[PDB]
Each structure stands twice: as C-alpha cells, then as structure tokens.
Amino acid sequence: VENPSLDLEQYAASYSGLMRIERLQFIADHCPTLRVEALKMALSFVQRTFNVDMYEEIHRKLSEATALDTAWVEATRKKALLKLEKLDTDLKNYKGNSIKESIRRGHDDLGDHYLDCGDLSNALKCYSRARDYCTSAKHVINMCLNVIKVSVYLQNWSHVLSYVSKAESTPEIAEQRGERDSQTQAILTKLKCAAGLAELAARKYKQAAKCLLLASFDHCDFPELLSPSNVAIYGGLCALATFDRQELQRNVISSSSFKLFLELEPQVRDIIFKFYESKYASCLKMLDEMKDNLLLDMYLAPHVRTLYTQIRNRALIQYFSPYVSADMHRMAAAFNTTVAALEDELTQLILEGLISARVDSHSKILYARDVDQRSTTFEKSLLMGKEFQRRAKAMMLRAAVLRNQIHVK
C-alpha cells in the first residue's frame, strides 16, 4: 500500500534528463493516500529540467485534488518559438552548404527541443528523415542509438528490439572478437540493456534475463536507459522466475559478471541465494517485503504480480522434488501459509502443472505418484484401435453414399 522506505530523492537523482519526470509520473499513479504529498515532493525536487506542459498538468491536478506567472511562461514559449525558428534557419543554411554533419546536428537539436517541449510526431518525422543520411559505421551506430532512445521514450518495443538486433548483426557480429575485449565506449552494454528492456516489456522474461546478465559494470550508469540497480533487480527477478537450477547456477550464481551488479542491491542477492539454498520462508518473506517498493517502478510494476506467481510456483516443485512422501504441515510452515491454502495450491498444481503427486487429506501427506508405463501403453493402444475401427466403418459408409449419389437438394 504505502511505503516510506523508498527514497524518492535518491531515486530521482539516480536518473538525469527528462526521463526522471516520467518515473515520477508513475509514483503519482501508484500512491494511495499519499499521491498529493508525493506529487508535492516531486514538484519541489524536480522542478528543474524545464517542465512546461507536465508542470501545468500537475499544478492543475493538485489544485483540483486539494493566477501564476503566466506571463513568464508565455514569454518562455515565445523564446522557444524564436529558438526553433533560428534552428530552422540554421538547418536551411546547412542544407544550402550541403554539410552532412551540420544537418545531422541541427536535426538532433530540433529533436532535443521537441523532447523538452513535448512534441513526438514532429520529432519522429525528423528522425525518420535524418535516418537516410549514413556514411560511416560510427554514424550508423550513433543514429541507431538516437532512434532507440527516442523509441524508448515513444514506447514501441518491437521496433527497438528489431533495430537493436539489426545493428548488432550488421558489423560482422560485433567485429568478431569484439575489438580487443570490447571498446572504451561501451555501446554493446547499452544495446544489451535496451534489448533486455524491450523483451521485458514484451512479456518475454527469459530473454530479458538471458541478455541482461551480459551487461558489464564498466558502463557505469546511463540515465536515458536503466540504472545499475534496476538492471540488477530485473536480471535477478526474471532469472529467478525463468531459469532452472542448472541455468541459475551457471549464469547467475557462478558467473563473475553479475555479482558486481548484485552488490548494489543486497536484497535480491539474498533472495536468489536463499532460493538456491532451499530456504523458502526467508526468500518469500523478503520477496513480499520488497514487492511493495517494486510496485512503484515504471517498467517492472505491470509484470510484478505474474513474476511473483511464477517464482512461488517454482519453489513448490523445488520443494517436492527430493521427496517421495512429504508432510504437509512442514510444507505449510516453510511457505508461511495454512494447510488448507497449501492443499488448494497443490491441487491446482497437480491438476495441470509439474507436480505429479496425490494428496492424502486424512493425514495431510503429499505422496509422489509413479506412473505405470505398461498399463498406459496398453490403454492408449486399445483406444487407438477402437477409434480406428470407428473411423474405418464411417468411411465405408461414406464411400457407399458417395457411390450411390445420395444428397439433399
């Protein structure tokens, strides 16, 4: 519900640029009985970065929930219009001079001004027009990054994933070896993070987990893209919910590239370790403690509930895996639920899922069920024979009616 453990000031300070406001918007969306105070704090802390339309929107929202210097904001709008006209004049001059770099810089500045103003369609058209100007691979990578970030702001993840894949596969698979163990400019980490975010938003958790663990710590933090803490949280939750024991051990537990990320968030590290070490009471308690804080995220909140269910389900099949007959009181104590709720969950899992067991509710014991292969094959073969005989008789009758030319007209 309400959680003061989340430091809004630090969370805003982690990101830079326009993106911060977007995140704060979700904090306004998910804040029962504290939306007004959270919005006031957001206005007090993040009044910078030249908020105009969202500033007025938030001001009107708080006025209607719980005049101004309109002359100055109108003068600022007029000055922005004059700056845009000057930029258009400079762009026309560059086109007359026929300089690719000059027109590229002018288009980038116009797109930046559209971003801080709020225009997206005109900016998108400008980016599409400027896409047709590529000379060297470095400029291709630069315009790919620009379009990827503006599409992340535009929230069209399929295009982001497709273009990330195309730009990754275009230069002979990242220059084969990778130009002597990657370059100083860690563009590949940015591409991996963008692909992970796109796949996570496209309801593909396993792919986001797989491609988000390859991001390295040398990239520091990209304010436009995800911060290291969010990278660790996403690559931990998706890995826990999707990777099996061998995959989790090989790619998360033992890999010497994600532990540095896990140092930023110790809670997710503890949760993953306790899941691996078959300690489920503590793991589930920490998961439930951190769920309330995670619900305030922007790219992970819609996927929270589902992920959690998945994680919990795994634990259940990981609890009963070594056992041939398990006492349900100990299971219920381990999972911090009552025996009746555990029985209902176990029945739901047995009906369809991976648990092959039977519940003895007289003594509350879950017995592992071992199928009999010979009887199963005999039953299936006899059923197939019966169905085949029925089909053959039906086809013979059909042949008779077709030969005799019987139909209704």
């Binding site: 039906a394 008779a400 009616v401 139909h407 209704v408």
Partner: protein, 121 residues
Amino acid sequence: GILKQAIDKMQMNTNQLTSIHADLCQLCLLAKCFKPALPYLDVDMMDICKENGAYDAKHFLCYYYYGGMIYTGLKNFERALYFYEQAITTPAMAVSHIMLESYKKYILVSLILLGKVQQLP
C-alpha cells in the same frame, strides 16, 4: 412384425441399407418398443439399395436419426453419438429439419458421454 420380415426378404444381405429401415425405426419408436429394432441397428450398413430409383436422402437421414434416438432411449450414448454424426455429415446443399435437430441432439449426447462437444469430421 411386418416391416421386419419385409426387410430381410427384400435386401441382398444384412449389411445392405434399404428404405424400410427408416419405417421400422419410426414405427418401433412411436410405440415404445425399442427391442425389435436392435438386430437391425447393431449391423453396420455398408451398401445402400438403389431401389430402381427413388431413395432420396430423406430415408438416409430418417434411419440414422431415428436409430440414434432409439439408442439414446436405451442409454447407449457411444453409438447414438455415432448415428447422429452419420446423420449430420450427409452431403447437403440445403437445410432440412433432420440435420438440424440431429446436430442439436449430437451436442447434448456428446456432453453426456464425453466432457466436450466432439469435433465433426
């Protein structure tokens, strides 16, 4: 008793469908005597009398619908479902009131016997 000795005396063999099977089924259905028709329904028909002409699809639909209703009355759903299926899948270019109120009963018998409406061929 008449359209029982008038069937085996006019058809070639037991596996030959004649236009009197429909009449026998209708007569033993109207008067609730479902036992006389059982020897004429347990046989899988595999040839159809041309009858020197005549024999429209009405006789085919009537036989394979009334037999299904007889089998339903005796709670033989495994074969009533098959009879209704044979009634429905007759080649058609128009709508008749024996292929409709056989699909409707096929749905119910499929729900009673199986747990789902079986897919037509």
